[PDB]
Design an enzyme around this catalytic site. Sequence first.
Site, mmCIF file in Angstrom:
data_model
loop_
_atom_site.group_PDB
_atom_site.id
_atom_site.type_symbol
_atom_site.label_atom_id
_atom_site.label_comp_id
_atom_site.label_asym_id
_atom_site.label_seq_id
_atom_site.Cartn_x
_atom_site.Cartn_y
_atom_site.Cartn_z
ATOM 1 C CB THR A 188 22.075 -8.690 -6.473
ATOM 2 O OG1 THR A 188 22.089 -9.930 -7.196
ATOM 3 C CG2 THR A 188 23.506 -8.159 -6.396
ATOM 4 C CB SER A 230 25.697 -10.267 -9.547
ATOM 5 O OG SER A 230 25.167 -10.925 -10.690
ATOM 6 C CB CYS A 267 23.753 -3.837 -14.088
ATOM 7 S SG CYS A 267 22.265 -3.777 -13.045
ATOM 8 C CG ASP A 316 26.397 -14.751 -6.958
ATOM 9 O OD1 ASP A 316 25.497 -14.803 -7.819
ATOM 10 O OD2 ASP A 316 27.595 -14.528 -7.244
HETATM 11 C C1 HEM Z 1 23.499 -3.658 -6.327
HETATM 12 C C2 HEM Z 1 22.713 -4.582 -7.032
HETATM 13 C C3 HEM Z 1 22.976 -5.014 -8.341
HETATM 14 C C4 HEM Z 1 24.148 -5.577 -8.825
HETATM 15 C C5 HEM Z 1 25.482 -5.705 -8.056
HETATM 16 C C6 HEM Z 1 23.861 -5.958 -10.206
HETATM 17 C C7 HEM Z 1 24.761 -6.624 -11.012
HETATM 18 C C8 HEM Z 1 24.507 -7.027 -12.304
HETATM 19 C C9 HEM Z 1 25.469 -7.775 -13.116
HETATM 20 C C10 HEM Z 1 26.897 -8.161 -12.722
HETATM 21 C C11 HEM Z 1 24.866 -7.983 -14.327
HETATM 22 C C12 HEM Z 1 25.508 -8.589 -15.570
HETATM 23 C C13 HEM Z 1 25.863 -7.514 -16.585
HETATM 24 C C14 HEM Z 1 26.592 -8.076 -17.798
HETATM 25 O O1 HEM Z 1 26.023 -8.957 -18.483
HETATM 26 O O2 HEM Z 1 27.733 -7.636 -18.065
HETATM 27 C C15 HEM Z 1 23.522 -7.401 -14.236
HETATM 28 C C16 HEM Z 1 22.565 -7.484 -15.241
HETATM 29 C C17 HEM Z 1 21.249 -7.020 -15.139
HETATM 30 N N1 HEM Z 1 20.706 -6.428 -14.007
HETATM 31 FE FE1 HEM Z 1 21.673 -5.835 -12.357
HETATM 32 N N2 HEM Z 1 22.547 -5.594 -10.590
HETATM 33 C C18 HEM Z 1 22.005 -5.019 -9.450
HETATM 34 C C19 HEM Z 1 20.716 -4.505 -9.354
HETATM 35 C C20 HEM Z 1 19.764 -4.538 -10.368
HETATM 36 C C21 HEM Z 1 18.391 -4.065 -10.198
HETATM 37 C C22 HEM Z 1 17.874 -3.247 -9.002
HETATM 38 C C23 HEM Z 1 17.725 -4.410 -11.345
HETATM 39 C C24 HEM Z 1 16.403 -4.116 -11.690
HETATM 40 C C25 HEM Z 1 15.801 -2.851 -11.560
HETATM 41 C C26 HEM Z 1 18.709 -5.077 -12.212
HETATM 42 C C27 HEM Z 1 18.436 -5.595 -13.493
HETATM 43 C C28 HEM Z 1 19.374 -6.226 -14.329
HETATM 44 C C29 HEM Z 1 19.091 -6.659 -15.682
HETATM 45 C C30 HEM Z 1 17.733 -6.596 -16.376
HETATM 46 C C31 HEM Z 1 20.266 -7.135 -16.195
HETATM 47 C C32 HEM Z 1 20.537 -7.650 -17.611
HETATM 48 C C33 HEM Z 1 21.071 -6.565 -18.533
HETATM 49 C C34 HEM Z 1 21.260 -7.051 -19.960
HETATM 50 O O3 HEM Z 1 21.527 -8.253 -20.141
HETATM 51 O O4 HEM Z 1 21.143 -6.230 -20.897
HETATM 52 N N3 HEM Z 1 19.960 -5.126 -11.614
HETATM 53 N N4 HEM Z 1 23.313 -6.804 -12.993
#
Ligand code: HEM
Length: 399
Positions: A239, A282, A348, A389
């Site tokens: 993403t 995403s 996130c 996506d």
């Molecule tokens: C610009 C890039 C990114 C976007 C747009 C993004 C977007 C998202 C979205 C839409 C979700 C769903 C949140 C929800 O359930 O409401 C999410 C979950 C998550 N993202 Fe990101 N993310 C990004 C970058 C990252 C990066 C760099 C990491 C790792 C270091 C990461 C790790 C995670 C994890 C582990 C979850 C699950 C959180 C949970 O369920 O508690 N994300 N992200």
Amino acid sequence: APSFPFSRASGPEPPAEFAKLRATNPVSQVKLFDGSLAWLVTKHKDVCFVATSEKLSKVRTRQGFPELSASGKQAAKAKPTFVDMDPPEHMHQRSMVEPTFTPEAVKNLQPYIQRTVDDLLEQMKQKGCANGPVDLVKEFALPVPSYIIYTLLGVPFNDLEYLTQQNAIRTNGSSTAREASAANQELLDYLAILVEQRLVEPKDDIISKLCTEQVKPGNIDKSDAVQIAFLLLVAGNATMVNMIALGVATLAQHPDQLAQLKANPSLAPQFVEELCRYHTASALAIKRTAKEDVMIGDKLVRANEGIIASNQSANRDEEVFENPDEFNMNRKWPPQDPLGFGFGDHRCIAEHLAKAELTTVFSTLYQKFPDLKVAVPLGKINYTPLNRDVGIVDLPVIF
Ligand code: HEM
């Protein structure tokens, strides 16, 4: 009921269905690949509700969970990490790795993020383009997020390049099923070794902290440590790469805004805010099944029925964002949170980190290469499959 996921109207556009649904049928039923039905929520207010309602669950072993593909159904069998947990399990595990992603921790990481970006840009300069265009993705968009997350996890400098290529093959559209799985297994195999090493002598990284604080005390075992680390790696890398690429393509689509960014890199933060709202890379992560009957809008979602909340649609919700389909870095923001990174408990974990990476990128890229230009007409840009996506596979550039 229409088949879902929907296909993007075009390369950089979101599915055309959403706008129509937001105006005529905000909460409707869509048909999944296996024929099952799920509730599709399209309005910002409703997406937020789904994201925080205690009557909804993210546990994939509950019948009715909206799996969008055959592979997704198979992945649901394995042991779950916090991404698929409900409270109190969710935070019990998420809090084990949140410390590195807090606003303060990310602020203190700014110099490191900048250094990583500067070094990759200089490598790109020296590499030059005197013989033709270079792929911005391979040379810049891919390694920026990759090196940062790999390094935070605990991967040594010398292994970054190989591991970065392998993780990309995981999601590469060109990759065959076998190639993607082999690459996936490789990353897991490598992580397993790292955990073993860090259990022996911890260093200043995420894997080491999991080993010392959770594994040793017996809170989780080695495999768990490997899976949590794997989640942090694969959850948002692809993403991040797509966001950086779409950011460059977007600035090329709106010359005056690029001129404005160049003239004032201090505008990077707002450009990033608009980018994450306009290009929701995403849009299929806010999914649930109802634990019990729950009312959403004028619909009654019955127990055991799955729900998909489109944060992409919510980000184009005309009721919340004026002129939603207009990319405007000088947009006057409402009190409602754009949902590029989700909402509620599961929001996130790396939102602050991701924004810091993007802000650093767009407050630096054009200062390093003030004349950066996409080396192909903008209408020929190679995007990801319309049924997936939004993102960009490759972006030829000259500078
Ligand atoms: C610009 C890039 C990114 C976007 C747009 C993004 C977007 C998202 C979205 C839409 C979700 C769903 C949140 C929800 O359930 O409401 C999410 C979950 C998550 N993202 Fe990101 N993310 C990004 C970058 C990252 C990066 C760099 C990491 C790792 C270091 C990461 C790790 C995670 C994890 C582990 C979850 C699950 C959180 C949970 O369920 O508690 N994300 N992200």
